Amino acid sequence: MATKAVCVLKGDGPVQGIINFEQKESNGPVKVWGSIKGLTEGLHGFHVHEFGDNTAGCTSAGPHFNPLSRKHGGPKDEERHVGDLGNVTADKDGVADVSIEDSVISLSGDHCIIGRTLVVHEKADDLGKGGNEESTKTGNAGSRLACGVIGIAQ
Amino acid sequence: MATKAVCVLKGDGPVQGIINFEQKESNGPVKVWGSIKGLTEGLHGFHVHEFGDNTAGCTSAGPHFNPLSRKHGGPKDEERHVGDLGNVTADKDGVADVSIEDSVISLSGDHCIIGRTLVVHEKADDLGKGGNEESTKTGNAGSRLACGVIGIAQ
Ligand SMILES: [Zn+2]
Ligand SMILES: [Zn+2]
Structure with a gap:
């Protein structure tokens, strides 16, 4: 289906950015790239x-x-x-x-991220290796600095 | 698949609002309701x-x-x-x-509006009856006062 998406990140502070998504093949990986500033x-x-x-x-x-x-x-x-x-x-x-390439998210199908929210967080993600209950839910990345809805792009 | 969606309208001026979408059946109408202020x-x-x-x-x-x-x-x-x-x-x-109900937009399938942009415009839409080229493209509705990406809602 959709091969290109985009997301404008905004928040209450100075964090803002534009993130692009591209998936040339519906069964292939999604490229994720762009720039976030104010971090x-x-x-x-x-x-x-x-x-x-x-x-x-x-x-x-x-x-x-x-x-x-x-x-x-x-x-x-x-x-x-x-x-x-x-x-x-x-x-x-x-x-x-x-600059991220991911093969689990998709721009179509059941793992489709179109119409969900990309969030950039206050702290590092501990990737589930932080030994607390929060690690297995959020990675202890903390509060939400900026976000945007992921939309279909040209 | 998605039965609810939501859109937060923001712009450069004072216009802002929240629009909800709900589609109980994928073969059924979408209810569109909410409030826009600053118009x-x-x-x-x-x-x-x-x-x-x-x-x-x-x-x-x-x-x-x-x-x-x-x-x-x-x-x-x-x-x-x-x-x-x-x-x-x-x-x-x-x-x-x-308060609108429409059976041409959908929250799934070919006509899915999730991940697209809802826009509220400056002027009245002439519903394509204006007799100029612009009527057949935009309804002469004028500039875009506020918009948001339509996202999946809980
Ligand atoms: Zn997670
Ligand atoms: Zn039109």
Whole structure:
């Protein structure tokens, strides 16, 4: 079906960005790339949450997109949420030049992320290896700095 | 698959609102309801545009969602874009209490509007009866006051 998507991230603070998604083959991986600025230096959790609902800001996006009812993990784990895209790294200038390729999310079918919410988080995702209950749900990535609904792009 | 959706309308000016979508059966009508504030009194074109792309504001959402390559019409016409939901009416307090039911838009399938952009326009939609070229494309509804990507709702 859809081969290109885009997401404009906004929030209450200075974090903002544009993230592109491209899936040339419906059964192949999704490329994810773009730039997020306004971030503190270092790692930031980068997740697709379940709902494309911004009525109460990023909170109403709900939890991680998890159609298979699994535990939070890193993108390379078998045990992961579909929305578990791991971390993005912001440099010393506050810019995260995102470049991710993922073969679990899709722009079509049951794992489709169109119309859900991409969220960039306050802290690093511990990829489910943090030893607490929060690690297996959110990776301890903390609060939602910016988000946007993932839309169909030209 | 998706039976509920939601859209948060924002723009450069004061227009803002929340629109809900609900489709109990995939072969059935979509109920569209909610509230838009900050509008001048009277009719405002109300359309699903093709792209869920807000990278340059509402302009990047593209033209009306039109997979059947038809001319613009009102919602009751057989010749209409899928995205042609006609007008909403703002009262003297600037509020449009939207309440629409449409069987051409869907929350699934070919006519799925999830991941596309809802736009509320500056002027009335002439429902394709204006007799100029613009009427058959946009209904002469004028500029885009506010928009949002339509996202999956809980
Ligand atoms: Zn997760
Ligand atoms: Zn139209």
